[PDB]
Write a protein that binds this ligand. Structure first.
Ligand SMILES: [Zn+2]
Ligand SMILES: [Zn+2]
Ligand SMILES: [Zn+2]
Ligand SMILES: [Zn+2]
Ligand SMILES: [Zn+2]
Ligand SMILES: [Zn+2]
Ligand SMILES: [Zn+2]
Length: 140
């Protein structure tokens, strides 16, 4: 069933689809072969390309992938920044991991504890689904 995580995504689905809101989902967890993974997911683009019923009904867990905005698997020596339709990866250094929302050109600092940026909020989701889940919400 849905805990805080899927409820949070369900609450944001309509506005992500329509473009009123653009959410980036940070998940740190593990793959199914015992390695930690983390990465940043463009929620609106995933909605556009996948039937989210699979996730809402618990048929599959949402997880970050190498094709997402950025993705890490330290055990596997993988760290990639492919960007996404809605976000460009613009910096990654001690001052922050920075994405730019392409439509409005505003900068998001997407470190899991970051001060997120203009018209962005960050919320940690308490969920048993993942080691850490953080949602950044950008109001365009
Ligand atoms: Zn798209
Ligand atoms: Zn697409
Ligand atoms: Zn739906
Ligand atoms: Zn999948
Ligand atoms: Zn490890
Ligand atoms: Zn940090
Ligand atoms: Zn706002």
């Amino acid at each position: 069933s849905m805990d805080n995580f899927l409820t949070a995504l369900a609450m944001r689905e309509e506005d992500n689809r329509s473009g009123k809101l653009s959410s980036v989902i940070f998940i740190r967890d593990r793959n199914s072969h015992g390695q930690e993974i983390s990465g940043y997911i463009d929620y609106a683009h995933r909605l556009k390309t996948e039937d989210f019923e699979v996730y809402f009904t618990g048929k599959k867990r949402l997880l970050p992938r190498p094709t997402d905005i950025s993705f890490y698997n330290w055990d596997a020596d993988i760290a990639v920044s492919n960007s996404s339709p809605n976000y460009q990866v613009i910096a990654d250094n001690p001052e922050g991991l920075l994405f730019r929302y392409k439509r409005d050109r505003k900068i998001l600092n997407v470190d899991p504890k970051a001060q997120p940026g203009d018209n962005s909020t960050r919320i940690t989701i308490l969920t048993e689904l993942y080691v850490q889940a953080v949602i950044f919400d950008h109001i365009s």
